[PDB]
Design a protein around this ligand. Structure first.
Ligand code: SF4
Ligand code: SF4
Length: 448
């Protein structure tokens, strides 16, 4: 709280031209563009300055304008008091969250694995055991409601006001009975707001199911990929969903296997069927980031993203959550960045066993002992790297925005969820940098 001021070392610069500098903070975000005069003021603060020194250094700018610039970028966290340790301040968020883990207030989401069957990777003992188990195949309505109720009772004691519940599987519509019973059971819930979603291949969608998903305002995330290496049934399901004005997203994979087939046609298809969003999942196999040219990966993502923007379709994915956090911070209040499995999610299997995520091998415990689940070492280990993935990340421009490569992938490759995958990191950094370079709706400060 002194008087000497300092440009934060976490402020990153992407120069667009000699009068345009795009700036963001590696922890906080705050993406914006500044003109040359404001950039000169910020850079003067690389050495600690008193405000009156900035006045005299410039002074061809009115003091009152210099004061406006300094105050705006202080509030953004781009200018700090000399001596402030910003990474220790960020890490305090992590330590506070770890210290309060027994409250359960960090639990924001249930991934409700209602079926492990599909219609007609892993690296732990517990996955082998329960993927096979005959009582872990179909979640009963009674067990589903009980599991959810245990979570709700815990988090409302922490005064949590919201909870997301994602119906997940194998193919969740193989267990519509349990989904429908859960929706009906909680229809009058008033202790907190429940938000639902469902991830499906959509093959089993009927007018009745579609009307019911709409009634409960359940966004439908449908797997879809362009022809590679069927579509009539996908069109049949989309036409049903669109008729009832359901919210539809596609989930598409950009991987070694889809790379040459991944193109912008999916946006034209989406617009035709009133699909609002297209999620792009980047390959979970780390060899993708060694074997494919990173600039070509980036261009495939950015081309789809920009053509989507031109067509009113939200092209998204974890990489886009990272980019949006760089514009407007939402991760601090959520307690996690793009991966909710770092303590924020309980992935509940039919027999009540609980993992970090269906994408992860991390076994937490069993819903018959939720307090034991939240106190166990594996749960603590996953929850402890939510804000800072690894000490690999401390000097990275994405530290406050990026969760690294999926837990399941680094579990398999390194046996260590703190071991960041360098190839994937390189891609993330290239992608975010290109998104910033190409942003058309940046907020720009001009000196006055
Ligand atoms: S995981 Fe990699 S890209 Fe992401 S913040 Fe850490 S070092 Fe940076
Ligand atoms: S563990 Fe993988 S699949 Fe699960 S939320 Fe994290 S990144 Fe996504």
């Amino acid at each position: 709280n002194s008087r000497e001021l300092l440009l934060s070392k976490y402020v990153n610069t992407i120069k667009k031209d000699d009068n345009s500098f795009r700036l963001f903070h590696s922890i906080h975000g705050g993406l914006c563009e500044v003109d040359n005069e404001i950039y000169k003021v910020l850079n003067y603060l690389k050495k600690s300055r008193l405000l009156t020194d900035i006045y005299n250094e410039f002074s061809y700018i009115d003091n009152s304008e210099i004061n406006d610039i300094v105050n705006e970028f202080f509030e953004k966290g781009f200018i700090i008091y000399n001596g402030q340790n910003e990474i220790e301040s960020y890490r305090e968020h992590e330590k506070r969250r770890i210290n309060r883990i027994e409250t359960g207030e960090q639990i924001k989401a249930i991934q409700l694995v209602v079926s492990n069957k599909c219609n007609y990777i892993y690296s732990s003992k517990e996955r082998e055991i329960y993927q096979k188990h005959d009582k872990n195949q179909i979640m009963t309505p009674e067990n589903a409601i009980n599991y959810i109720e245990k979570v709700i009772e815990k988090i409302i004691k922490a005064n949590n006001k919201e909870l997301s519940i994602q119906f997940f599987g194998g193919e969740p519509l193989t267990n519509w009975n349990t989904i429908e019973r859960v929706l009906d059971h909680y229809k009058n819930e008033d202790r907190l707001k429940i938000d639902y979603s469902i991830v499906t291949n959509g093959a089993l969608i009927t007018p009745k199911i579609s009307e019911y998903l709409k009634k409960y305002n359940v966004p439908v995330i449908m797997s879809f990929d362009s022809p590679n290496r069927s579509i009539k049934n996908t069109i049949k399901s989309l036409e049903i969903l669109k008729e009832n004005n359901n919210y539809i997203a596609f989930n598409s994979v950009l991987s070694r296997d889809t790379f040459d087939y991944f193109n912008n046609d999916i946006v034209d298809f989406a617009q035709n069927y009133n699909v609002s969003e297209i999620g792009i999942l980047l390959d979970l196999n780390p060899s993708f980031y060694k074997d494919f040219n990173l600039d070509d990966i980036v261009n495939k993502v950015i081309d789809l993203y920009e053509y989507g923007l031109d067509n009113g379709i939200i092209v998204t994915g974890y990489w886009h959550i990272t980019y949006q956090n760089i514009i407007m911070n939402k991760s601090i209040d959520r307690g996690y960045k793009t991966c909710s499995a770092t303590g924020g999610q309980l992935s509940i299997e039919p027999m009540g066993v609980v993992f970090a995520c269906k994408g992860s091998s991390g076994y937490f415990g069993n819903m018959n002992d939720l307090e034991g689940l939240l106190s166990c070492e594996n749960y603590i280990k996953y929850a402890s790297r939510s804000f800072i993935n690894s000490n690999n990340c401390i000097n990275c421009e994405l530290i406050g925005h990026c969760s690294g490569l999926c837990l399941g992938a680094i579990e398999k490759k390194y046996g260590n969820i703190m071991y960041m995958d360098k190839g994937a990191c390189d891609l993330y950094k290239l992608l975010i940098r290109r998104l910033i370079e190409r942003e058309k709706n940046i907020f720009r400060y001009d000196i006055d």
